[PDB]
Amino acid sequence: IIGGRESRPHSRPYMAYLQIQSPAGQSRCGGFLVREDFVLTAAHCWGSNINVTLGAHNIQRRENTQQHITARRAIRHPQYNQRTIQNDIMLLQLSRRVRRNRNVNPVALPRAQEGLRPGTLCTVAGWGRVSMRRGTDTLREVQLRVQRDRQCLRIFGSYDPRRQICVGDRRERKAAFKGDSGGPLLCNNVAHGIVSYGKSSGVPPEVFTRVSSFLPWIRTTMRS
Ligand SMILES: COC(=O)N(C)Cc1c(C(=O)O)n(Cc2cccc3ccc(F)cc23)c2ccccc12
Numbered sequence: 727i728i729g730g731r732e733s734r735p736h737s738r739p740y741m742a743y744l745q746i747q748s749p750a751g752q753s754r755c756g757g758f759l760v761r762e763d764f765v766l767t768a769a770h771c772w773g774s775n776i777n778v779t780l781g782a783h784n785i786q787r788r789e790n791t792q793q794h795i796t797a798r799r800a801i802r803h804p805q806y807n808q809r810t811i812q813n814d815i816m817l818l819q820l821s822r823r824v825r826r827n828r829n830v831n832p833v834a835l836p837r838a839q840e841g842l843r844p845g846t847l848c849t850v851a852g853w854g855r856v857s858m859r860r861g862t863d864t865l866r867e868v869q870l871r872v873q874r875d876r877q878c879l880r881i882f883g884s885y886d887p888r889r890q891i892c893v894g895d896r897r898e899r900k901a902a903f904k905g906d907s908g909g910p911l912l913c914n915n916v917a918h919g920i921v922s923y924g925k926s927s928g929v930p931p932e933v934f935t936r937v938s939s940f941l942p943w944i945r946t947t948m949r950s
Pocket residue numbers: 746753754755770771772773811902903904905906907921922923924925926928932
């Protein structure tokens with residue numbers, strides 16, 4: 727998170743830290759618990775082995791609040807496209823259910839035709855980089871404003887407002903950045919978006935997946 731603050735410890739108990747391994751090496755992402763057995767994140771966070779930590783604030787130290795669960799299944803959207811970064815959404819089936827408590831519980835999703843309009847203020851949280859090269863051990867957060875479609879259409883050739891949200895005022899040094907991928911955009915306590923991508927500079931606007939567009943695929947997947 728660029729330009730943010732340390733979160734109040736355990737104030738966002740839906741937050742998941744992902745440690746990802748594949749032949750391509752090690753990666754880090756965020757994610758969020760949407761049911762006792764499922765975490766939602768981005769498809770570009772896929773790996774052959776993913777371990778999830780819930781209940782964390784400082785993910786570099788042991789805390790008896792943490793729950794460590796390997797993902798039994800990593801289900802990318804069937805039309806996820808690496809090249810355009812379209813349909814950037816993935817469900818993790820946990821190998822066991824979490825023990826729900828003050829520090830570990832799910833977050834609500836939007837309704838289908840509810841919407842999210844320019845000018846809405848939201849929060850994004852994660853363990854990602856705070857500048858170009860430096861990181862953090864502890865969860866951080868920042869408030870970002872929803873931008874108009876054209877502000878992303880102008881700078882991102884493959885942007886589609888049917889499936890993506892445009893986020894962050896270029897006037898402020900405030901953004902989700904590397905390490906924050908997969909984490910939630912919370913608006914009025916609901917997870918409307920998923921951190922997807924942006925410019926290497928970290929200067930907004932940036933691109934989130936629009937959850938409302940994938941609700942059918944989400945529901946069908948979790949039901950089966
Ligand atoms: C297996 O996992 C991985 O390979 N990864 C997690 C690496 C990866 C990241 C990442 O480091 O988070 N991002 C997000 C991203 C990258 C660059 C600029 C950004 C600016 C703003 C922003 F909010 C996000 C940005 C990706 C996007 C697409 C593909 C891969 C990645």
